[PDB]
Amino acid sequence: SHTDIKVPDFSDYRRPEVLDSTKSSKESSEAR
Amino acid sequence: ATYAQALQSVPETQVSQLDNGLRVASEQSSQPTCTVGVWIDAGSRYESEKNNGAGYFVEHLAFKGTKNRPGNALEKEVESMGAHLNAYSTREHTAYYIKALSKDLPKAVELLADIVQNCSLEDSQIEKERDVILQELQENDTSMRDVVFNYLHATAFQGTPLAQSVEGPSENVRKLSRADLTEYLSRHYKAPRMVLAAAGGLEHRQLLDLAQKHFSGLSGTVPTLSPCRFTGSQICHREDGLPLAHVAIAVEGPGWAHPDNVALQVANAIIGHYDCTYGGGAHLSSPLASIAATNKLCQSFQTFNICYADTGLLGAHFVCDHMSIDDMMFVLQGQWMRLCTSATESEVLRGKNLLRNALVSHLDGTTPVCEDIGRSLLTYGRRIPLAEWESRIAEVDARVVREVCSKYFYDQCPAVAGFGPIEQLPDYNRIRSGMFWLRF
Amino acid sequence: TNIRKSHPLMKIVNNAFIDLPAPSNISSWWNFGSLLGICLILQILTGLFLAMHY
Amino acid sequence: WLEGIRKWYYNAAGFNKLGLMRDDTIHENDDVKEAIRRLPENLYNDRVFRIKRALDLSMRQQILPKEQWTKYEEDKSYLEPYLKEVIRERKEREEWAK
Amino acid sequence: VLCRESLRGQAAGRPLVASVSLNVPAS
Amino acid sequence: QDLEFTRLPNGLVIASLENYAPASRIGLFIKAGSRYENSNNLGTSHLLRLASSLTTKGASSFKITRGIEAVGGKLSVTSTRENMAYTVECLRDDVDILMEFLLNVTTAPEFRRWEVAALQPQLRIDKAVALQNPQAHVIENLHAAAYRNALANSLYCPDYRIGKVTPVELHDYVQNHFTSARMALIGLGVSHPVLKQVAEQFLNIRGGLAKAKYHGGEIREQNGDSLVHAALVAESAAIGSAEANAFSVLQHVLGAGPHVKRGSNATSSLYQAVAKGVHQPFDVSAFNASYSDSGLFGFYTISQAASAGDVIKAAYNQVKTIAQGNLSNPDVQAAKNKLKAGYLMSVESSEGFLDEVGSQALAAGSYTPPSTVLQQIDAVADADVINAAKKFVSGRKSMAASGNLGHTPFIDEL
Amino acid sequence: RYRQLARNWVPTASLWGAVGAVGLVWATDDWVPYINGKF
Amino acid sequence: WALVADLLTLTWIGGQPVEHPYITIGQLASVLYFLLILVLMPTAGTIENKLLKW
Ligand SMILES: CCCCCCCCCCCCCCCCCC(=O)OC[C@H](COP(=O)([O-])OCC(O)COP(=O)([O-])OC[C@@H](COC(=O)CCCCCCCCCCCCCCCCC)OC(=O)CCCCCCCCCCCCCCCCC)OC(=O)CCCCCCCCCCCCCCCCC
Ligand SMILES: CCCCCCCC/C=C\CCCCCCCC(=O)O[C@H](COC(=O)CCCCCCCCCCC)COP(=O)(O)OCCN
Ligand code: HEM
Ligand SMILES: CCCCCCCCCCCCO[C@@H]1O[C@H](CO)[C@@H](O[C@H]2O[C@H](CO)[C@@H](O)[C@H](O)[C@H]2O)[C@H](O)[C@H]1O
Ligand SMILES: CC1=NC2=C(COCC2)C(=O)[C@@H]1c1ccc(Oc2ccc(OC(F)(F)F)cc2)cc1
Q: Which residues pair with B234 in a beta bridge?
A: B416
Is B196 in contact with B215 (CB distance < 8 Å)?
yes
How many angstroms separate the Cα of F138 from the Cα of each of E11, F64, F216, F287?
11, 36, 15, 12
DSSP label at residue B21: -
Work out which ligand 5 atom sits closest to the CA atom of C16: 1
Pairing of strands B233-238, B415-420: parallel
* B416: Cβ contacts below 8 Å, ≥ 6 apart: B152, B155, B233, B234, B235, B236, B247, B248, B249, B425, B428, B431
How many angstroms separate the Cα of F186 from the Cα of each of E19, F240, F362, G29?
18, 20, 11, 78
Is F404 in contact with F224 (CB distance < 8 Å)?
yes
Of the candidates B279, B246, B9, the one whose C-alpha atom is nearest the C-alpha of residue A2 is B246
CA angle F142, F278, F414 (to 5 degrees): 40
Write the single-letter amino acid at F315.
A
DSSP label at residue G7: -
Q: What are phi and psi of C20, to 5 degrees?
A: -55, 120
Of the candidates B38, B114, B34, B31, the one whose C-alpha atom is nearest the C-alpha of residue B77 is B114
Of B433, B435, B439, the one to substitute when testing ligand 2's pocket (max ligand atoms within 8 A of C-beta) is B433
* D26: Cβ contacts below 8 Å, ≥ 6 apart: D32, D79, H54
Ligand index nearest the alpha carbon of residue B341: 2
Q: How far is E25 from chain F (nearest CA, A)?
A: 10
Q: Is the bond preceding B106 in cis, omega lying within 30 degrees of 0?
A: no
Confirm or reject contact between B132 and chain E (CB < 8 A). yes
Of the candidates F197, F86, F348, F94, the one whose C-alpha atom is nearest the C-alpha of residue B6 is F94
Is B370 in contact with B35 (CB distance < 8 Å)?
yes
List b or e across B288-321, with b for residues whose CB sees 16 or more CB atoms inside 10 angstroms.
Answer: bbbbbbeeebbbbbbbbbbbbbebbbbbbbbbbb
Neighbouring chains of H at 3+ CB pairs within 8 Å?
D
Q: Which of B173, B195, B221 is the last residue in one of the domains?
A: B221
Confirm or reject contact between B346 and chain G (CB < 8 A). yes
Q: Burial, F212: exposed, middle or buried (Cβ in 10 Å; 0-12, 13-18, 19+)? A: buried
Q: Is the CB of C25 under 6 A from ligand 1?
A: no
For residues C31 and B31, give the distance between their C-alpha atoms in angstroms, rounded to a whole number. 86
For residues B202 and B373, give the distance between their C-alpha atoms in angstroms, rounded to a whole number. 15
Contact B346 G12 (CB under 8 A): no
CA–centroid distance, residue C25 to ligand 5 (Å):
17
Pick left, alpha or beta for residue B200 (phi over 0 → left; psi -120 to 50 → alpha; otherwise beta): left
Neighbours of B362 (CB within 10 A): 11
Confirm or reject contact between D88 and chain G (CB < 8 A). no
Chain G CB contacts of B344 below 8 Å: 2, 5-6
For residues F5 and F13, give the distance between their C-alpha atoms in angstroms, rounded to a whole number. 7
Q: Which residues pair with F260 in a beta bridge?
A: B85
Contact E13 F288 (CB under 8 A): yes
Is F412 in contact with F343 (CB distance < 8 Å)?
no
Chain D residues 16-35 with a CB less than 8 Å from chain C: none
Q: How far is D38 from chain F (nearest CA, A)?
A: 6
Give me the domain span that covers residue B38: 13-221
* D24: Cβ contacts below 8 Å, ≥ 6 apart: D15, D47, D50, D51, D54
For residues C54 and F12, give the distance between their C-alpha atoms in angstroms, rounded to a whole number. 100
SS3 F86: strand
| Closest CA in chain A for residue B155 | A7
Could you give the number of structural domains in chain B? Answer: 2
Is F59 in contact with F105 (CB distance < 8 Å)?
no
H or E element: which one contains B212?
helix B204-215
Q: Which of B221, B247, B275 is the last residue in one of the domains?
A: B221
Q: Is the CB of C29 under 6 A from ligand 1?
A: yes
For residues B430 and F52, give the distance between their C-alpha atoms in angstroms, rounded to a whole number. 41
* Catalytic residue of the set B27, B59, B129, B252: B59
Q: HSE of B376 in the Cβ direction (CA atoms, 13 Å)?
A: 22
| Domains of chain F, first to last | 1-210 (3.30.830.10), 211-414 (3.30.830.10)
Q: Burial, D30: exposed, middle or buried (Cβ in 10 Å; 0-12, 13-18, 19+)? A: exposed
Q: How far is B349 from chain F (nearest CA, A)?
A: 8
SS3 B263: helix
SS3 F232: strand
Q: Which residues pair with E21 in a beta bridge?
A: F76
Work out which ligand 2 atom sits closest to the CA atom of B438: 45
* Cross-chain CB nearest to G5 (options B398, B439, B440): B398
Chain D CB contacts of F63 below 8 Å: 92, 96
Q: Let me know if residue B1 belongs to a domain.
A: no
SS3 F79: strand
| Closest CA in chain D for residue C26 | D59
DSSP label at residue H40: I
List b or e across B75-113, with b for residues whose CB sees 16 or more CB atoms inside 10 angstroms.
Answer: bbbbbbbbbbbbbbbbbbbbbbbbbbbbebbebbbbbbb
Neighbours of C48 (CB within 10 A): 9
SS3 B5: helix
How many angstroms separate the Cα of F56 from the Cα of each of B266, D94, F38, F64, F85?
31, 20, 26, 9, 18
Q: Which residues pair with F7 in a beta bridge?
A: F13
Chain A CB contacts of B169 below 8 Å: 1, 3-4, 6
| CATH of residue D94 | 1.10.1090.10
Q: Let me know if residue B132 belongs to a domain.
A: yes
Q: Which residues pair with F91 in a beta bridge?
A: F23
Give the DSSP per-residue string, D1-65: -HHHHHHHHHHHH-GGGGT--GGGGS---HHHHHHHHT--HHHHHHHHHHHHHHHHHHHHT----
Determine the CATH number of domain G1-39.
Answer: 1.20.5.220
Is B201 in contact with B365 (CB distance < 8 Å)?
no
* B322: Cβ contacts below 8 Å, ≥ 6 apart: B240, B244, B245, B420, B421, B422, B423, B424
Q: Atom 9 (ligand 5): residue with closest C-alpha?
A: C22
CA–centroid distance, residue C37 to ligand 5 (Å):
6
Q: Atom 26 (ligand 5): residue with closest C-alpha?
A: C37
Helices (H), B242-381: 260-271, 287-294, 325-342, 345-362, 366-379
Q: Please give all residues whose beta carbon lies within 6 A of any atom in ligand 4, as ranges.
A: H 20, 23-24
For residues A28 and A10, give the distance between their C-alpha atoms in angstroms, rounded to a whole number. 17
For residues B135 and E1, give the distance between their C-alpha atoms in angstroms, rounded to a whole number. 9
SS3 F154: coil
Q: Of how many residues is chain E composed?
A: 27
- B239 and B217 in a common domain: no
Of the candidates F52, F25, F86, the one whose C-alpha atom is nearest the C-alpha of residue F354 is F25
Of the candidates B242, B176, B194, the one whose C-alpha atom is nearest the C-alpha of residue B38 is B194
For residues B316 and B298, give the distance between their C-alpha atoms in angstroms, rounded to a whole number. 13
Q: HSE of F236 in the Cβ direction (CA atoms, 13 Å)?
A: 31
Pairing of strands B84-89, B13-17: unpaired
Q: Let me know if residue B4 belongs to a domain.
A: no
Q: How many CB pairs under 8 A join D and F?
A: 13
For residues F288 and F385, give the distance between their C-alpha atoms in angstroms, rounded to a whole number. 14
- B271 and B169 in a common domain: no
Is F364 in contact with F322 (CB distance < 8 Å)?
no
Is F236 in contact with F295 (CB distance < 8 Å)?
yes
SS3 F224: coil
Write the single-letter amino acid at F236.
S
| Closest CA in chain G for residue D95 | G1
Contact A4 B151 (CB under 8 A): no
Is B411 in contact with B436 (CB distance < 8 Å)?
yes
For residues B399 and F339, give the distance between their C-alpha atoms in angstroms, rounded to a whole number. 53
For residues F405 and F223, give the distance between their C-alpha atoms in angstroms, rounded to a whole number. 8
Q: How far is E19 from chain F (nearest CA, A)?
A: 4
Chain E residues 1-27 with a CB less than 8 Å from chain B: 1-3, 5-6, 20-26
Of the candidates B210, B218, B343, B324, the one whose C-alpha atom is nearest the C-alpha of residue B276 is B324
Is F130 in contact with E26 (CB distance < 8 Å)?
yes
Torsion angle, alpha carbons of D49, D51, D56, D58, to 10: 160
For residues F177 and F172, give the distance between their C-alpha atoms in angstroms, rounded to a whole number. 8
The reply to whether B12 belongs to the active site is: no
DSSP label at residue F109: B
Could you give the number of structural domains in chain D? Answer: 1
- B246 and B209 in a common domain: no
Contact D56 C23 (CB under 8 A): no
Q: Is the CB of B233 under 6 A from ligand 2?
A: no
Of the candidates F214, F219, F243, the one whose C-alpha atom is nearest the C-alpha of residue F231 is F219
* F134: Cβ contacts below 8 Å, ≥ 6 apart: F225, F229, F402
* F20: Cβ contacts below 8 Å, ≥ 6 apart: B1, B6, B9, F189
Q: What are phi and psi of H20, to 5 degrees?
A: -65, 145
Write the single-letter amino acid at B361.
S
Is B319 in contact with B144 (CB distance < 8 Å)?
yes
H or E element: which one contains F24?
strand F23-30
Contact F63 D89 (CB under 8 A): no
Confirm or reject contact between A20 and chain B (CB < 8 A). yes
Torsion angle, alpha carbons of F174, F175, F177, F178, to 10: 70
Q: How many CB pairs under 8 A join D and G?
A: 4
CA–centroid distance, residue C33 to ligand 3 (Å):
21
For residues B329 and F68, give the distance between their C-alpha atoms in angstroms, rounded to a whole number. 28
Q: Which of B190, B221, B252 is the last residue in one of the domains?
A: B221
For residues F360 and F345, give the distance between their C-alpha atoms in angstroms, rounded to a whole number. 17
Is B348 in contact with B396 (CB distance < 8 Å)?
yes
State how far Cα F320 lies from the chain centre.
27
Contact F22 B360 (CB under 8 A): yes
* D8: Cβ contacts below 8 Å, ≥ 6 apart: none
Pairing of strands B245-252, B273-275: unpaired
Is G19 in contact with B364 (CB distance < 8 Å)?
no
Work out which ligand 4 atom sits closest to the CA atom of H19: 18
SS3 letters for F283-305? EEEEEEEECCCCEEEEEEEEEEC
Of C14, C34, C40, the one to substitute when testing ligand 5's pocket (max ligand atoms within 8 A of C-beta) is C34
Give me the domain span that covers residue D43: 1-98
* B151: Cβ contacts below 8 Å, ≥ 6 apart: A2, A5, B235, B237, B248, B417, B419
For residues G33 and F383, give the distance between their C-alpha atoms in angstroms, rounded to a whole number. 106
Q: HSE of D56 in the Cβ direction (CA atoms, 13 Å)?
A: 8
Q: How far is H51 from chain D (nearest CA, A)?
A: 5
How many angstroms separate the Cα of F96 from the Cα of each of D59, F57, F59, F67, F73?
61, 18, 14, 12, 12
CA–centroid distance, residue H26 to ligand 1 (Å):
26
Q: Which residues pair with B304 in a beta bridge?
A: B315
Neighbours of H36 (CB within 10 A): 17
For residues B291 and B282, give the distance between their C-alpha atoms in angstroms, rounded to a whole number. 7
Q: HSE of B315 in the Cβ direction (CA atoms, 13 Å)?
A: 24
Ranges of beta strands (E only) in B7-69 are 13-17, 23-28, 33-40
Q: How far is D93 from chain G (nearest CA, A)?
A: 13
Q: Burial, F200: exposed, middle or buried (Cβ in 10 Å; 0-12, 13-18, 19+)? A: middle
For chain E, report the end-to-end CA distance as a whole number of angstroms. 20
Confirm or reject contact between B92 and chain G (CB < 8 A). no
Of the candidates B407, B431, B399, B175, the one whose C-alpha atom is nearest the C-alpha of residue B312 is B407
CA–centroid distance, residue H18 to ligand 4 (Å):
12
List b or e across F223-233, with b for residues whose CB sees 16 or more CB atoms inside 10 angstroms.
Answer: eebebbbbbbb
Is F260 in contact with B63 (CB distance < 8 Å)?
yes
Q: Is the CB of B330 under 6 A from ligand 2?
A: no
Write the single-letter amino acid at C40.
L
For residues F373 and F364, give the distance between their C-alpha atoms in angstroms, rounded to a whole number. 14
Give the DSSP per-residue string, F301-343: EEEETTTHHHHHHHHHHHHHHHHTT---HHHHHHHHHHHHHHH
Q: Let me know if residue B227 belongs to a domain.
A: no
| Closest CA in chain F for residue B346 | F70
For chain D, report the end-to-end CA distance as a whole number of angstroms. 43
For residues F1 and B183, give the distance between their C-alpha atoms in angstroms, rounded to a whole number. 51
Helix, strand and coil content of chain G, in percent to the nearest 5, comes to 50, 0, 50
Q: What are phi and psi of F305, to 5 degrees?
A: -65, -40
For chain C, report the end-to-end CA distance as a whole number of angstroms. 51
For chain B, report the end-to-end CA distance as a whole number of angstroms. 46
| CATH of residue B81 | 3.30.830.10
CA Rg value for chain A: 12
CA–centroid distance, residue C43 to ligand 3 (Å):
7
State how far Cα B80 lies from the chain centre.
31
State how far Cα F220 lies from the chain centre.
23
For residues F392 and F232, give the distance between their C-alpha atoms in angstroms, rounded to a whole number. 10
For chain A, report the end-to-end CA distance as a whole number of angstroms. 37
CA Rg value for chain C: 17
How was it solved? X-ray
